[PDB]
């Protein structure tokens, strides 16, 4: 219930402590989802963008940046990776959807679709998650790793319990996202832990 | 008899099992043909795009991607290769024609002609093929190789028993192909085997 | 009290001793500041752009170019670094701000914001500085290092005791800078030491 | 005489056999000449573009591609080479002129002049040539070398017994060449030997 | 007293002999000068562009190209070098000025200023020079070096006994140079020695 429109979280340093917890009242396992957000980082090493863990389940839903031009999604421990030509460093808009019935994961980078990949067909992503920005969880809420920490800025984060069609991905990219029912940047419940600063978004 | 307009086959993972069989009424050997399709893959290793084998004849008609920027056509186990400047990764539209009387092979990449090459002048491509997408055949219908598997998306596949002139190549590229009499994306008989998913084409 | 409009300092050679002292009656420690200037150098080795030391304190406020595309700010010996795509050699406009309350350092290169970083939250930059262009200080006013010397041209330098908003940054870059209260190019007090020549600015 | 307007010779494979003989009625030594043609090849090794030998005299007039971006002219066994930034692979339009009185050779690539070079000032290129496309001659009409063979397509070839000024070079590049008196694509006397196929020009 | 408007000197081969002597009415030592000319060469090795020697003094005023993207000026055997982004091979317009009072050398490449450098403050360039294009002098008029020879084309050369302001540099670049009192392409006294050919300028 905080509207962060026009603002970003800044993770201004590398650490094993700095992070934001995102709170969602999700109690039903997910068959489908889409996650979109905007990020600006000049890290060359790998890092976690979005870490969603549940009780007894590490890497239940994880968006991980392997290196420049390579984006990975983990579902239930398994992963897929797709490549893109991108400038570095540069602000980026990232969406990824996943659909249990087919296992298909769709990444979109700056409104451009990456090659589809597939994993975990028939799997249900569990609910009552702990969701962390800034660090990658290895436990339910913790066990961070400095070498996976995100340094930079994140904004405009939305998560839906459905697979967005292309037009709705583009809406989000263009700054007019459709209402989101899992996480909503315009009505976000979060906890800052450590050194995270909220600043205006100046790089769009 | 299936209309796949606006859809693609997604081969969402590397494997030695996942493939699509394409079924054609072909009992007469081929003197002339054109084959067009659209593909999107972020593999950098080599892979088969279109594998056509006949009884006792490996690589009877094979479209094979050597590496970024290099496309090969095999006719009757002989091969030619032509080069092109292309982005990686990127969607591509590929056409290739071959004419027995001259032996000339013409590749067209995104509506741009590659340098013509020639092979097997006077040869007839054998009939009663097994045609496979997703894997490269070494037997009549099988003996696949994981290191040659296609991971990504293929759509808009057409095959004609004639050599198309440039305007019809361009028309296919532009999404208004001439009706095709060997294989036709709008009236396709196919068999999915293993993990292959049909999805909307979102990258044109 | 000198108007350097349309002029630059030229540091025309590598040396250990050529430099300009910038004089400001700065008696109270700084909680906030912004520094903007234009520079043109074809050095590929590291160099100091702006060196501010106080008695007994090295690198109290230092803007340092590590290598092409990498800009560093030191506050009380601690540093942050941010990256940018830039041409080399090329003239550049650089602004950097820092805010004690948040620790946030903002670099802007040719009116483009770099990724925010953060350091020294709650700190105050010490007053009574010696401020040097052309050389990096390791003592209070001296102990230079030719391998860190700046060779090239600097102009349009301003320093304010506040964090400028983006509109004021862009005005400095391409419009009328807001008059500045610590250092101001239209009313600058300076001392030339060694081989430094004032010339018209010809590269904007 | 044959009008090859809108057509090309296709040398579809590497060989020591495949070539075209061109026949001119001139029957005089050459003091001045210009030669223009279009070519499209994806060879990265060296190759002969135009080979003119006379009785007992190798490399009497030879246009030879050393590697991407490097064009050589031999006159009377001596050579010059000039460089250009060019795309690879790509269609190219090539003109070269030579003037005995000055020795000056001018290459023009896609209507752009390369650096002038000079050779054989005062020499007369011998009369009664054998002129070959597709292979490099080492004898009067033969002694080819597969490692110097041209694989690809050639069209729009014209040769004049004078040095064309820039405006006439550009006319040739644009597809409105002045009528030519040594060799003329619109009234060409030629002999195909081995595997050379005439096809429509599809790459302009 | 020869008007070379629209023409260039072509140095069509590497040699230790080919050169042009430029003859000037200059008789007093030089405190200030500007030298502009256009050049086109595809040499990648080092070479001399303009060699001005006086009795007993090598490298009295020398414009030397170290390698692509790097231009050097020698005054009285001392050297400065400045860098630029340039295409290779490509025609270039080069101006360089030097002012004894400050020691400042200003290179301009295609109307774009390079970083200023400084040398020989207070020095007077000696009079009664021998000025050579095509070779680098090590004696008063001679002692050439094949590995420093200029191969290619030079035109539009002007030398003034003052430091030109930017507007006048740009005029020369654009083809409307001010009349020049040391050397002037429209009223030039020169001696061709060896293989140098005058041709029309075709690459502007
Ligand atoms: C998941 O999404 C698909 C469309 O992608 C939809 O057809 C399906 O009903 C969704 N499943 C659930 C449980 O909402
Ligand atoms: C194949 O093409 C050639 C030339 O285009 C033509 O002569 C021949 O009839 C074609 N063959 C068939 C069966 O159409
Ligand atoms: C400086 O900005 C701070 C935040 O660091 C702000 O709260 C304060 O008012 C400013 N301090 C001064 C001396 O202007
Ligand atoms: C070749 O060109 C030169 C120009 O130098 C001219 O003098 C000469 O007559 C030309 N030769 C012929 C046969 O036209
Ligand atoms: C050289 O230039 C300076 C300007 O800095 C000028 O004062 C001086 O007179 C010039 N010398 C001559 C002989 O013109
Ligand atoms: C161990 C490791 O490198 N990674 C990469 C992201 C997921 C997984 C982890 O830390 O849990
Ligand atoms: C053996 C091999 O490397 N290749 C490449 C494509 C055709 C052929 C094959 O697998 O049959
Ligand atoms: C020691 C060193 O390499 N540096 C780089 C700039 C700051 C610091 C110094 O010279 O004081
Ligand atoms: C021997 C050789 O390498 N060459 C290159 C072209 C001309 C010459 C020849 O084969 O005759
Ligand atoms: C010796 C040498 O390499 N050089 C480079 C230019 C100046 C100087 C000379 O030849 O005189
Ligand atoms: Ca984990
Ligand atoms: Ca971890
Ligand atoms: Ca096979
Ligand atoms: Ca195989
Ligand atoms: Ca220091
Ligand atoms: Ca130091
Ligand atoms: Ca030969
Ligand atoms: Ca040969
Ligand atoms: Ca010398
Ligand atoms: Ca020398």
Q: Is the peptide bond before C91 cis (omega within 30 degrees of 0)?
A: no
What class does CATH assign to D1-204?
mainly beta
Q: What is the DSSP string of A143-180?
A: ---GGG---EEEEEEEEESS---HHHHHHHHHT-PPP-
Within its chain, how far is the Cα of C53 from the centroid?
Answer: 13
Half-sphere exposure of C19 (CA within 13 A, CB side): 26
Burial of B123 (0-12, 13-18, 19+ CB in 10 A): middle
The answer to whether A192 touches A3, Cβ cutoff 8 Å, is no
CB atoms near residue D14 (< 10 Å): 15
Q: How far apart are CA D131 and CA B167, in angstroms?
A: 35
Q: How far apart are CA E20 and CA C187, in angstroms?
A: 52
**DSSP letter assigned to residue D188:** B
Tokens of A44: 């060359």
* Residue B136, marked binder: yes
User: Which ligand sits nearest to residue A58's alpha carbon?
Assistant: 11
- CB of E124 less than 8 A from some CB of D: no
Every domain of chain A and the residues it spans: 1-204
Nearest CA in chain E to D165: E202
Q: What is the DSSP string of B39-56?
A: EE----S-EEEEEEEETT
* Residue A18, marked binder: no
> Considering only residues 171 to 200 of chain D, which have any Cβ-Cβ distance to chain B shorter than 8 Å?
195, 197, 199
Q: How far apart are CA E156 and CA E186, in angstroms?
A: 8
Tokens of A76: 């239930």
Burial of E51 (0-12, 13-18, 19+ CB in 10 A): buried
| Beta strand C32-40 pairing with C7-11 | unpaired
CB A99 near ligand 1, within 6 Å? yes
Scanning the structure block, which residue is given the tokens 């004894």?
E100
* Residue A58, marked binder: yes
Give, for ligand 5, the residue of E26, E28, E30, E31 to mutate: max count of ligand atoms closer than 8 Å to Cβ.
E31
Residue nearest to atom 1 of ligand 7 (CA): B138
Q: Identify residues whose C-beta is under 5 A from ligand 11, the ion.
A: A 58-59, 138
Do chains D and B meet with 3 or more Cβ pairs nearer than 8 Å?
Answer: yes
The answer to whether A134 touches A11, Cβ cutoff 8 Å, is yes
What three-state secondary structure class fits D81? strand
Q: How far apart are CA C37 and CA C91, in angstroms?
A: 11
> Considering only residues 61 to 90 of chain A, which have any Cβ-Cβ distance to chain B shorter than 8 Å?
80, 82-85
* Residue from C115, C118, C164, C167 whose CB has the most chain A CBs within 10 Å, to mutate: C115
Resolution (A): 1.5
Of A42, A88, A197, the CB nearest to C118: A197
Give, for ligand 2, the residue of B26, B27, B33, B101 to mutate: max count of ligand atoms closer than 8 Å to Cβ.
B101
- CB of A7 less than 8 A from some CB of B: no
Q: How far apart are CA B19 and CA B149, in angstroms?
A: 9
Question: Which residues in chain B have Cβ-Cβ distances shorter than 8 Å to A104?
Answer: 10, 12, 197, 199
Provide the H-helix boundaries in chain B: 166-174
Closest CA to E48 of E158, E132, E108: E132
Question: Which residues in chain A have Cβ-Cβ distances shorter than 8 Å to B13?
Answer: 80, 117-119
Closest CA to B37 of B165, B153, B144: B153
Q: How far apart are CA D196 and CA D8, in angstroms?
A: 10
Nearest CA in chain D to E39: D115
CB C174 near ligand 3, within 6 Å? no
Ligand 5: residues whose CB is within 6 Å?
A: E 31-32, 99, 101
Angstrom distances, CA of residue C163 to CA of C24, C33, C114, C118, C121: 19, 5, 15, 14, 14
CB A163 near ligand 1, within 6 Å? yes
Half-sphere exposure of E141 (CA within 13 A, CB side): 5
Do chains B and E meet with 3 or more Cβ pairs nearer than 8 Å?
Answer: no
Q: Which atom of ligand 5 is nearest to the CA of E28?
A: 13
Tokens of E26: 């200059």
Angstrom distances, CA of residue E163 to CA of E31, E95, E102, E187: 10, 11, 12, 20
* Residue B148, marked binder: yes
C170-179: long-range contacts at Cβ-Cβ below 8 A with a sequence spacing of 24 or more?
A: C170/C111, C172/C36, C172/C93, C172/C95, C173/C36, C173/C93, C173/C95, C173/C108, C173/C110, C173/C111, C174/C111, C177/C36
Q: How far apart are CA B96 and CA B34, in angstroms?
A: 6
C66 phi/psi in degrees, rounded to 5? -70, -45
Q: How far apart are CA A7 and CA E58, in angstroms?
A: 65
Scanning the structure block, which residue is given the tokens 């579809």?
D12
3-state helix, strand, coil in chain C (%, to 5): 5, 45, 50
Scanning the structure block, which residue is given the tokens 């941010």?
C82
Of D88, D195, D202, the CB nearest to B118: D195
**Cα(C67) to centroid of ligand 1, in Å?**
51
Q: How far apart are CA D37 and CA D173, in angstroms?
A: 9
Burial of B87 (0-12, 13-18, 19+ CB in 10 A): exposed
Q: Is the peptide bond before B21 cis (omega within 30 degrees of 0)?
A: no
> Which residues in chain B have their C atom more than 2.5 Å from the N of the next written residue, marking a break after them?
none
Contacts of A among chains (3+ CB pairs under 8 A): B, C
**Cα(D195) to centroid of ligand 2, in Å?**
19
Residue nearest to atom 1 of ligand 10 (CA): E138
CB atoms near residue E202 (< 10 Å): 17
> Considering only residues 140 to 169 of chain A, which have any Cβ-Cβ distance to chain C shorter than 8 Å?
151-153
């Amino acid at each position: 219930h905080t509207d962060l429109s026009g603002k970003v979280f800044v993770f201004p340093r590398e650490s094993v402590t700095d992070h934001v917890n995102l709170i969602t009242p999700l109690e039903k396992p997910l068959q489908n989802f889409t996650l979109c957000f905007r990020a600006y980082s000049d890290l060359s090493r790998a890092y976690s963008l979005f870490s969603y863990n549940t009780q007894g389940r590490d890497n239940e839903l994880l968006v991980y940046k392997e290196r420049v031009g390579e984006y990975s999604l983990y579902i239930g421990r398994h992963k897929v990776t797709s490549k893109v030509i991108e400038k570095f460093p540069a602000p980026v808009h990232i969406c990824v959807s996943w659909e249990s019935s087919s296992g298909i994961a769709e990444f979109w980078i700056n409104g451009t679709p990456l090659v589809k990949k597939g994993l975990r067909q028939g799997y249900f992503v569990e609910a009552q998650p702990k969701i962390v920005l800034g660090q990658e969880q290895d436990s339910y809420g913790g066990k961070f790793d400095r070498s996976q920490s995100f340094v930079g800025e994140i904004g405009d984060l939305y998560m839906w319990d459905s697979v967005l069609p292309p037009e709705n991905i583009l809406s989000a990219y263009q700054g007019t996202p459709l209402p989101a029912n899992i996480l909503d940047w315009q009505a976000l419940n979060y906890e800052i832990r450590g050194y995270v600063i909220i600043k205006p978004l100046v790089w769009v």
